[PDB]
Amino acid sequence: EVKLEESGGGLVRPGGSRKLSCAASGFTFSSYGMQWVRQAPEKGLEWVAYISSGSRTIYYADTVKGRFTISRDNPKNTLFLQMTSLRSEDTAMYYCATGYGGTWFAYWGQGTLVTVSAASTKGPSVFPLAPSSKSTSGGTAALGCLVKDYFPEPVTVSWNSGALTSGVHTFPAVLQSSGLYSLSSVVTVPSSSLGTQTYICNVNHKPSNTKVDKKVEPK
Amino acid sequence: KKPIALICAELYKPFQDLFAALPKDCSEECQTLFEDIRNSHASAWSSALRIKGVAYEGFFSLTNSWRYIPEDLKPTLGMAIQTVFPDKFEKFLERTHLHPEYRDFTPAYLMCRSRVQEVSSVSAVVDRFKSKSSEKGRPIRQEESRPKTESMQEDIEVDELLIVEVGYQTDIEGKVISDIEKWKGVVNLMSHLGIKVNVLTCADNSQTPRTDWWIDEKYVRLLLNSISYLFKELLEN
Amino acid sequence: QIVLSQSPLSLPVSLGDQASISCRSSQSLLHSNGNTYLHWYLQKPGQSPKLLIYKVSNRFSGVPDRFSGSGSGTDFTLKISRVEAEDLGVYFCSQSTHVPYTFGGGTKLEIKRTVAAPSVFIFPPSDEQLKSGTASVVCLLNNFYPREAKVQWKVDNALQSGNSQESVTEQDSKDSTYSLSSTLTLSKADYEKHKVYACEVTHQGLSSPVTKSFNRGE
Numbered sequence: 001e002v003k004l005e006e007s008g009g010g011l012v013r014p015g016g017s018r019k020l021s022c023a024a025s026g027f028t029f030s031s032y033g034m035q036w037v038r039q040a041p042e043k044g045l046e047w048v049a050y051i052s053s054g055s056r057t058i059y060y061a062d063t064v065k066g067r068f069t070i071s072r073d074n075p076k077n078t079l080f081l082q083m084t085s086l087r088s089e090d091t092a093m094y095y096c097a098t099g100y101g102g103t104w105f106a107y108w109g110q111g112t113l114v115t116v117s118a119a120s121t122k123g124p125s126v127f128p129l130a131p132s133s134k135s136t137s138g139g140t141a142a143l144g145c146l147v148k149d150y151f152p153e154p155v156t157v158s159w160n161s162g163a164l165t166s167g168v169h170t171f172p173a174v175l176q177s178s179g180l181y182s183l184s185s186v187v188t189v190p191s192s193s194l195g196t197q198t199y200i201c202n203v204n205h206k207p208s209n210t211k212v213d214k215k216v217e218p219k
Numbered sequence: 220k221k222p223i224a225l226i227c228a229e230l231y232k233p234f235q236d237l238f239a240a241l242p243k244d245c246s247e248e249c250q251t252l253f254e255d256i257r258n259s260h261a262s263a264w265s266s267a268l269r270i271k272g273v274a275y276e277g278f279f280s281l282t283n284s285w286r287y288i289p290e291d292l293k294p295t296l297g298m299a300i301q302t303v304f305p306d307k308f309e310k311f312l313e314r315t316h317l318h319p320e321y322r323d324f325t326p327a328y329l330m331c332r333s334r335v336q337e338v339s340s341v342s343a344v345v346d347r348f349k350s351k352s353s354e355k356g357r358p359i360r361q362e363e364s365r366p367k368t369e370s371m372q373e374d375i376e377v378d379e380l381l382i383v384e385v386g387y388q389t390d391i392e393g394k395v396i397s398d399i400e401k402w403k404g405v406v407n408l409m410s411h412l413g414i415k416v417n418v419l420t421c422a423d424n425s426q427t428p429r430t431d432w433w434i435d436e437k438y439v440r441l442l443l444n445s446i447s448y449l450f451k452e453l454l455e456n
Numbered sequence: 457q458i459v460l461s462q463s464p465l466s467l468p469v470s471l472g473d474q475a476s477i478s479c480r481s482s483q484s485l486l487h488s489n490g491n492t493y494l495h496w497y498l499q500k501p502g503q504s505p506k507l508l509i510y511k512v513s514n515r516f517s518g519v520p521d522r523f524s525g526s527g528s529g530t531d532f533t534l535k536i537s538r539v540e541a542e543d544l545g546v547y548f549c550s551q552s553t554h555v556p557y558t559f560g561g562g563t564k565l566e567i568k569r570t571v572a573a574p575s576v577f578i579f580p581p582s583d584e585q586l587k588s589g590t591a592s593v594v595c596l597l598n599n600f601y602p603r604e605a606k607v608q609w610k611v612d613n614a615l616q617s618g619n620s621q622e623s624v625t626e627q628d629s630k631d632s633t634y635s636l637s638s639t640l641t642l643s644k645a646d647y648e649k650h651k652v653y654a655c656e657v658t659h660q661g662l663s664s665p666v667t668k669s670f671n672r673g674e
Contacts, residue, residue: 032373035557037505044559044560044561044562045499045559052371056346099373101374103371103373103493104507104550105495108506127585127592129594130582135579135596142577142596146582146585146592171623171625171635172625183623184623186598188575369487369488370487370493370554370555370557372489415488
């Protein structure tokens, strides 16, 4: 099966550099043009570069010219992107893609996230959103966690170590003017289960090796 | 102090070595012209000029394993479009009414990719010139047709032509710059016909180090010990 | 550059109905080699894009036959003959006839469902946070449809501006609703100088705008 596995993302200071790689398997990599495409958070797709099979033709998006270099090592089945003089607007998910016989994007990788920013890696503060009469409708109570001021992105929230998925809404993070992110995760549960059931949200922030388990209890 | 006849004498062994390594129609031509020189200072100069270039173009054919085409049998641009792109050839006449001279332009080499002489990879040639230019600073000029800002494509192949211009003159940059200005209009014409053409141009002179010409050194020595010497002796005496 | 115009921006479609998305090209995408390099992609929420159709009308291997494309020159259409739940996502047209390769901005296909008023809940600041010198008040609009909703903050009946932010989930894959959080952040000090913290919700599924409030002390 055709597979493209990107690596190389992570945090990068404005003006800094980074090299992204992509491992190809499942096809004769040396015969096909490869591409990079990116997607800034909550936005559309934006093409980045193309490189022919023997590297004779290279195309660049005008917005990365003179800062990004695309290349490939064919005996090694790998595709590279050297990124330099990065700006905060280069914050994106980066994908390698190929047409496997065309210039369309037939196959994509899962993407690798590149964050260009001078905010320092910080784990989240995690506060409880208490069930009360102001969060009850019928026999149903809402509760949740407020995950505030963490950086950079990826945070994963689960409830009761993932046993509790029904009714769970984990909202998209909002980039705040401080440069940090915050989100909220909520869940609706039966009101009859307050007092008897234990609600604990599990916040994992791998970039800061932070794991938080907050208990949520009625006030 | 030396009469034409005597010069052609002292340069008989250096010239036999020249005609021996050239292709047939090249050796054959450069031989006629050397007998007009022996039976010639103007008329002799005029013949020694044509030998200079005809001999270079035969060693250029040799070096690049291409075929030496004598000028009488070289194709014109309109000839390559007629045969290679017939479905556009009528439209190649309409858009050339204000510049009908385009139709008869005749390069040193009018190649096309294996479906006018045929070459394996047009891109492999352009890269060998670009490599030497970059590695030895040898002046070249290259142009490529490109309808609008179109991309290359990997799912279909297209016929394409290669237009090479060579030359053995003392002003190398002027030749490549003047060559590229002459094909520029037609290259822009091809962009508007959807016809993929590539124009190369280069030149050597006798001041170029023997290890850095577009012809192998062995052919440079052959050219220097003969066509050049004859030219020195032609002005002196 | 070749600009690709997708219409509509969003396309509400009931399960089983047809869908047509439209892509208009600022210049012709006919390539001099005879092909037209106009392509369609689906991006399901949270995944990487997927090729649907390439070269106007060639369906990519493995793609269900409910997807088709037509067109020429500058005018192109993608059709979903019969919409399935899985087809939820953003659809992109792309061109590779010309450098730079370019995308439309995407058409969000949402699944039509019956109208659902939001359940409106409000959460005071936690004591843990009030000790850190800040007060977040969360207002939750849960499981509503359609997406159009207006959420405003009022403190002691004074409208608030510049101190709140809102987040919205994608359309739920099972029940086809939206949820929305609005967070009002005041300094602990500012939070201590007011009594009523209200949240006003307007949605077409409510008989009237709903104000879900609380008083600090309690």
